[PDB]
Amino acid sequence: SMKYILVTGGVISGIGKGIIASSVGTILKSCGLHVTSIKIDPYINIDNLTTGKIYQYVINKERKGDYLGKTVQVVPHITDAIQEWVMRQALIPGLEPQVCVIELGGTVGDIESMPFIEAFRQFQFKVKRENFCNIHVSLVPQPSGEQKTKPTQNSVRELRGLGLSPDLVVCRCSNPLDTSVKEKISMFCHVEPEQVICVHDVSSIYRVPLLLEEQGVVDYFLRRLDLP
Amino acid sequence: SMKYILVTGGVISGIGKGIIASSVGTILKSCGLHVTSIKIDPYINIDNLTTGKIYQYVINKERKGDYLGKTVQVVPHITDAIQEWVMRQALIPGLEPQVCVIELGGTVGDIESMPFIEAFRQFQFKVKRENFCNIHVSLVPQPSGEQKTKPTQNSVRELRGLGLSPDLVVCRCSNPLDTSVKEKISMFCHVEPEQVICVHDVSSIYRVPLLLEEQGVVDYFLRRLDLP
Amino acid sequence: QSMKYILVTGGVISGIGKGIIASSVGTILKSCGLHVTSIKIDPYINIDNNLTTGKIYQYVINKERKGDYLGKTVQVVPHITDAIQEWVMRQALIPVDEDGLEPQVCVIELGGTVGDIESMPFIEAFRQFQFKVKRENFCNIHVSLVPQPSSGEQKTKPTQNSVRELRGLGLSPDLVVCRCSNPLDTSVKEKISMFCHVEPEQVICVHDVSSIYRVPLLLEEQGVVDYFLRRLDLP
Amino acid sequence: QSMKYILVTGGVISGIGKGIIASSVGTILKSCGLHVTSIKIDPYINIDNNLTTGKIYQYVINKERKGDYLGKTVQVVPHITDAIQEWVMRQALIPVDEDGLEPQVCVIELGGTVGDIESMPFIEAFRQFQFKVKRENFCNIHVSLVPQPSSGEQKTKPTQNSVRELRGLGLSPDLVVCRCSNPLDTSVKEKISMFCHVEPEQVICVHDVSSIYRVPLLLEEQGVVDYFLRRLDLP
């Protein structure tokens, strides 16, 4: 049965969910794991899953009486759609994908992503625990000069309330995170210090995979998801 | 130019937004004011404004290139739709309606109502201040035995953050609110004590209008909205 | 075996019945012949075995005044929250028995309502405490209100909101205890189960009863004692 | 004429430049020949004209111990929050001048970051204070961060979230002051304007400057002095 990594973002946009999501795909592909991808775009466009897509799906489903005359809502009707859609895709490569990485676009706290964050809150409990993961990418600012953790505290705090607890907390730095600083992120985000990852400003994006690998993200995933 | 009363709900459903919304319509109609109604149903059905209705509107608008190839979102695209829709209806009776009462269905905090609460947050600033109102209906529980205010504090607190400050706070009691208790609701909800209204368990729904009238809701509205 | 902690917290309204629940958990565990101890925390400034805000602040205030924090800035977090955990640890250890062994379980009643300013230090205190003492030995009961208007259906919103809030503050209930007037339908408690993160078996109904003494009986009937044994690996 | 209050609060990150802004508002008003006074509040336990948490708690603790609350339960709210308002009132009144008239304006620097546990009593204190002293005489500046990643656009989310939070805690900024590295586009500040509830003219840019002494000049250039005269009806 499918293994899932969800990648959510906090604090701001342009934080690098794309790069971490691909990097995690690449590190995983390089263990003989057949990995696959879903990009969720919370925007209303019908053009990979979008809000308009899943809404129009449910909207005309109702319009032809699939819901039997009773009132259709975000929970469970939209949220089920999203969860079913995810599972259909996780299967598409003729050997099936073993792990699936879900890039959730937008930022946690956004109104557009509320349905999607709720869908996955429900989904972690549907699939087993050993089959679902949550990587939260957040900004650790630093004006020259100490590295500031509160934005990530609050972001992780928000996501916890919305029902997901991050399993790694990947932090966008400029200079690497000091031990003390990620030990502080640990204190407040519930993960252990090794599960706080700094992806600092590397001069090129091909490093991010190596930057992830060497902070033990390969090893963690195998243990966390149970993987050959 | 149109005057608007928005009626939102807090704490629980079945609180009586329907009854207060109609009562306010009735008290207002009985001053030679031509009053009109919008019922917003945050549910996905396309059958008075609903989520499915406003989404399908925007969805196929985009699908025929009205939005010029750029990404459509809840803010401003859905929220504009909602605001424009509201104004079109406020005009439909051949003398035009002077005041319009918007029943916002669901409960504040719900994911389904987030777009609608944001639409009106923006709308209060679009129309003038003397043309827009917000009535928040909340539960004041009481197990036999003191009347409990926190649910309303938190509900009003939530709505304030989401960008609307209530102008009256109508409280569903079983027994009338004690002066001290609505003086406490005043302390935390920013309104003055006279703007806290208790609509307690009356033996019939035709009293609610009289219950509202005698707590000065007629007089307040004239002053708050500037009305003949 | 190491100390086991049961934290009782309240949501939605005060006077929801924390104290009674706290006492009933104490009684029903004690009934198994466990050696149970009890700690009350009032989040008020008034200055045992009964912690209060003023008691804790004065403690940390005095320490700082006497140099104990080595001239560093002293703060609600970590310094007040450290004091709250230190105190709970110490009291929990004191005997309360026929003869002097450490208690096996300590039921903590936290006053106030989740979300209140006055209870924020305490929730945070215990958010950290659950990781210090391992989660195997920590356990949180959240008492909430399920209104039932005659305008027939049993409302779960307040519980949903209160447990979202508590979650975000960093504690996720192990048992959700609902005060309501009639007993909850299975579906209503499967809905709470869904939204909070507990199995339906861990949504406990405490409906209107003839006497407060029927409440420990209500709890036993809904399998709580067996829950705590399984959950905190008690004998 | 009656005392005028300017409250400076911080969001998103600490070290965002509250103190500098607070000082610059003091300087630029003083430059108009107003008699301005300054109050610092550190939300720490360490025990002027400089309020601290331990100072306030010890105050209320002592009072209760000596019976001043007539045997009633004493709480963060209203009792600590009463103390914070009482103190601000008293200090604000003390002269700071060539000769002894009451100050015309009092700039209050609140330490901490909106959302922190340690600052909750204070925000609440001032939520109530704005209605006691009328809103005509009360005025809140919120300093926030606007990150600018090279991955070109100036980010408003953190400000949006921080002002939602502050709003909900019961203060709505009159001026939003953005720390960022370059100056903000008009559109970026119209966006903040939209989300928070201020006109674009009241979104103030404080970008990277050669010296801290250029910051009062930055403020004057963006019309703040004229804002405060209009907003607090000062001469």
Tell me, yes or no, if A187 comes closer than 8 A to chain C by beta carbon: yes
Q: Which helix (H) or strand (E) holds B138?
A: strand B132-139
For residue A83, give how far its alpha carbon lies from the nearest alpha carbon of chain D (Å): 28
Contacts of C20 in chain B (CB under 8 A): none
Contacts of B157 in chain D (CB under 8 A): 168, 170
Residue D33's region, left for phi above 0, alpha for psi from -120 to 50, else beta, is left
Tally of domains within chain D: 1
What the block records as the tokens of B162 is: 């989401």
For residue C233, give how far its alpha carbon lies from the nearest alpha carbon of chain B (Å): 37
After which residues does chain A show a gap where C to N exceeds 2.5 Å?
Answer: 47, 93, 144
Which residue spans within chain C are E strands per DSSP? 4-10, 36-42, 50-52, 105-110, 138-145, 175-179, 203-206
Give yes or no for a contact between A127 and A140, defined as CB atoms under 8 angstroms apart: no
What the block records as the tokens of D183 is: 């100056």
Give yes or no for a contact between A87 and A2, defined as CB atoms under 8 angstroms apart: yes
Nearest-angstrom CA–CA distance, C225 and C32: 8
Distances in Å between the alpha carbon of D93 and those of A190, B39, B125, D1, D111? 47, 52, 37, 13, 21
Nearest-angstrom CA–CA distance, C6 and C130: 11
Put simply, the answer to whether A122 touches C194 (Cβ < 8 Å) is yes
What the block records as the tokens of B172 is: 């569903």
Nearest-angstrom CA–CA distance, B59 and B52: 10
Lookup result for tokens 């140099």: C67
Q: Out of D57, D65, D73, whose CB is closest to C57?
A: D57
For residue C214, count other CB atoms closer than 10 A to its CB: 15
Whether residue D182 has a cis bond before it, omega within 30° of 0: no
Residues 6 or more apart from D44 whose CB is under 8 A from it?
A: C73, C74, C75, D52, D53, D54, D111, D118
The DSSP letter of residue C117 is: G
What the block records as the tokens of A36 is: 């696959």
Sheet-wide strand order for C50-52: C50-52, C36-42, C105-110, C4-10, C138-145, C175-179, C203-206
Give yes or no for a contact between D204 and D217, defined as CB atoms under 8 angstroms apart: no
What the block records as the tokens of C166 is: 């508590």
Tell me, yes or no, if A16 comes closer than 8 A to chain D by beta carbon: yes
Residues 6 or more apart from C218 whose CB is under 8 A from it?
A: C24, C205, C206, C207, C209
Q: Which helix (H) or strand (E) holds D110?
A: strand D105-110
User: Solved by what technique?
Assistant: X-ray
Q: Which helix (H) or strand (E) holds C128?
A: helix C120-132
Contacts of D14 in chain A (CB under 8 A): 148, 150
Nearest-angstrom CA–CA distance, B134 and B156: 11
Nearest-angstrom CA–CA distance, D152 and D205: 17
Tell me, yes or no, if C14 comes closer than 8 A to chain D by beta carbon: no
The DSSP letter of residue C71 is: T
- Selected residues 102-121 of chain C with any CB under 8 Å from a CB in chain D: 117-118, 120-121
For residue A109, give how far its alpha carbon lies from the nearest alpha carbon of chain B (Å): 12
Chains interfacing with A (3 or more CB pairs < 8 Å): B, C, D
Put simply, the answer to whether C165 touches A161 (Cβ < 8 Å) is yes
Contacts of D131 in chain B (CB under 8 A): 190
In chain C, whose CA is at the least distance from the CA of A124? C197
What the block records as the tokens of D85 is: 């308002």
We report the CATH number of the domain holding residue A90 as 3.40.50.300
What the block records as the tokens of D159 is: 């400000």
Tell me, yes or no, if C148 comes closer than 8 A to chain B by beta carbon: no
The DSSP letter of residue D204 is: E
After which residues does chain B show a gap where C to N exceeds 2.5 Å?
Answer: 47, 93, 144
Residue C46's Cβ-side half-sphere holds a number of Cα atoms within 13 Å equal to 12
Nearest-angstrom CA–CA distance, B110 and C185: 23
Put simply, the answer to whether D170 touches B160 (Cβ < 8 Å) is yes
In chain C, whose CA is at the least distance from the CA of D80? C45
Local structure of C233: helix, strand or coil:
coil
SS3 per-residue string spanning chain A = CCEEEEEEECCCCCCCHHHHHHHHHHHHHCCCCCEEEEEEECCCCCCCEEHHHHHHHHHHHHHCCCCCCCCCCHHHHHHHHHHHHHHHHHCCCCCCCCEEEEEECCCCCCCCCHHHHHHHHHHHHHCCHHHEEEEEEEECCCCCCCCCCHHHHHHHHHHHHHCCCCCEEEEECCCCCCHHHHHHHHHHHCCCHHHEEEECCCCCCCHHHHHHHHCCHHHHHHHHHCCC
Contacts of D43 in chain C (CB under 8 A): 75-76
Chains interfacing with B (3 or more CB pairs < 8 Å): A, C, D
Local structure of B170: helix, strand or coil:
strand
Local structure of C158: helix, strand or coil:
helix
After which residues does chain D show a gap where C to N exceeds 2.5 Å?
Answer: 47, 151
Whether residue D147 has a cis bond before it, omega within 30° of 0: no
Nearest-angstrom CA–CA distance, B157 and B12: 15
Orientation angle between helical segments B51-63 and A51-63, nearest 10 degrees: 120
Put simply, the answer to whether C157 touches B15 (Cβ < 8 Å) is no
Q: Which helix (H) or strand (E) holds D109?
A: strand D105-110
The DSSP letter of residue B23 is: H
Q: Can you name the residues that pair with B134 across neighbouring β-strands?
A: B6
Residue in B182, B131, B188, B181 with CA at minimum distance from that of residue B159? B188
Tell me, yes or no, if C60 comes closer than 8 A to chain D by beta carbon: yes
Query: Burial letters for B88-125: b for 16+ Cβ neighbours within 10 Å, e otherwise?
Result: ebbeeeeeebbbbbbbbbbbbbbbbbbbbbbbbbbbbe
Residue in A201, A193, A197, A227 with CA at minimum distance from that of residue A212? A197
For residue D34, count other CB atoms closer than 10 A to its CB: 19
Residue C65's region, left for phi above 0, alpha for psi from -120 to 50, else beta, is alpha
DSSP conformation letters of B173-222: -SS---HHHHHHHHHHHSS-GGGEEEE---SSTTHHHHHHHHTTHHHHHH
Distances in Å between the alpha carbon of A188 and those of A121, C168, D29? 20, 11, 41
Contacts of D116 in chain A (CB under 8 A): 150
Lookup result for tokens 């972690």: A124
Give yes or no for a contact between D196 and D158, defined as CB atoms under 8 angstroms apart: no
For residue C51, give how far its alpha carbon lies from the nearest alpha carbon of chain D (Å): 14
Residue B208's region, left for phi above 0, alpha for psi from -120 to 50, else beta, is alpha
Tell me, yes or no, if B161 comes closer than 8 A to chain D by beta carbon: yes
Residue in D132, D213, D131 with CA at minimum distance from that of residue D172? D131
Residues 6 or more apart from A138 whose CB is under 8 A from it?
A: A9, A10, A11, A15, A151, A152, A155, A156, A169, A170, A171, A172
What the block records as the tokens of A96 is: 């099936």
Put simply, the answer to whether C153 touches B14 (Cβ < 8 Å) is yes
Residue in C92, C5, C3, C79 with CA at minimum distance from that of residue C49? C92
Rg (CA), chain B: 18
Domain that holds residue D108: 1-235
In chain A, whose CA is at the least distance from the CA of B62? A45
Give yes or no for a contact between D227 and D204, defined as CB atoms under 8 angstroms apart: no
After which residues does chain C show a gap where C to N exceeds 2.5 Å?
Answer: 47, 151
Tell me, yes or no, if D197 comes closer than 8 A to chain B by beta carbon: yes
Length of chain B: 228
Give yes or no for a contact between C60 and D45, defined as CB atoms under 8 angstroms apart: yes
Torsion (CA) D86, D89, D95, D100 in degrees, nearest 10: -100
Q: What is the resolution of this structure in A?
A: 2.8
The residue type at D138: F
A88-97 contacts at long range (C-beta below 8 A, 24 or more positions apart): A89/A36, A89/A38, A89/A49, A90/A2, A90/A4, A90/A36, A90/A38, A91/A2, A92/A36, A93/A34, A93/A36, A95/A34, A96/A34, A97/A2, A97/A34, A97/A35, A97/A36
Nearest-angstrom CA–CA distance, B1 and B5: 14
Give yes or no for a contact between B104 and B41, defined as CB atoms under 8 angstroms apart: no
Put simply, the answer to whether A74 touches B112 (Cβ < 8 Å) is yes
For residue B65, count other CB atoms closer than 10 A to its CB: 8
Nearest-angstrom CA–CA distance, B132 and B2: 9
For residue A29, count other CB atoms closer than 10 A to its CB: 13
Residue in D119, D148, D128 with CA at minimum distance from that of residue D9? D119
Q: Out of C57, C65, C76, whose CB is closest to D117?
A: C76
Q: Out of C145, C153, C161, whose CB is closest to B141?
A: C145
Q: Can you name the residues that pair with D204 across neighbouring β-strands?
A: D177
The DSSP letter of residue C17 is: S
Give yes or no for a contact between B206 and B196, defined as CB atoms under 8 angstroms apart: no
Nearest-angstrom CA–CA distance, D104 and D87: 17
Nearest-angstrom CA–CA distance, D154 and D163: 17
Orientation angle between helical segments D224-232 and D18-31, nearest 10 degrees: 70
Distances in Å between the alpha carbon of D80 and those of A158, B75, C81, D59, D66? 28, 40, 19, 9, 16
DSSP conformation letters of D33-99: T--EEEEEEE-SS----EEEHHHHHHHHHHHHHTTTTTT----IIIIIHHHHHHHHHHHHHS--SSS
> C201: burial class by Cβ within 10 Å (0-12, 13-18, 19+)?
middle
For residue D59, count other CB atoms closer than 10 A to its CB: 18
Nearest-angstrom CA–CA distance, C65 and C76: 16
> B28: burial class by Cβ within 10 Å (0-12, 13-18, 19+)?
buried
What the block records as the tokens of B75 is: 């803010």
DSSP conformation letters of D125-194: HHHHHHHHS-GGGEEEEEEEE-------PPP-HHHHHHHHHHHHHT---SEEEEE-SSPPPHHHHHHHHH
Nearest-angstrom CA–CA distance, D121 and B39: 40
Interface probe with C: pick from B154, B173, B181, most Cβ of C within 10 Å? B154
Residues 6 or more apart from D91 whose CB is under 8 A from it?
A: D37, D39, D49, D51, D106
Sign of the alpha-carbon dihedral angle for A53, A59, A63, A69: positive
Nearest-angstrom CA–CA distance, C91 and A199: 44
Put simply, the answer to whether D117 touches C74 (Cβ < 8 Å) is no
Sign of the alpha-carbon dihedral angle for A13, A18, A21, A27: negative
Orientation angle between helical segments C157-169 and A150-162, nearest 10 degrees: 150
What the block records as the tokens of C99 is: 């003869």
Sheet-wide strand order for D36-42: D50-52, D36-42, D105-110, D4-10, D138-145, D175-179, D203-206
Contacts of C115 in chain B (CB under 8 A): 150, 154
Q: In degrees, to the nearest 5, what angle opens at C-alpha A97 toward C-alphas A91 and A100?
A: 85
Chains interfacing with C (3 or more CB pairs < 8 Å): A, B, D
Give yes or no for a contact between A101 and A5, defined as CB atoms under 8 angstroms apart: yes
Nearest-angstrom CA–CA distance, D165 and B157: 10
Q: Which helix (H) or strand (E) holds D221?
A: helix D215-221
> At residue B92, what are phi and psi to the nearest 5 degrees?
-90, 120
Nearest-angstrom CA–CA distance, A215 and A208: 11
Nearest-angstrom CA–CA distance, B102 and B86: 9
Whether residue C78 has a cis bond before it, omega within 30° of 0: yes
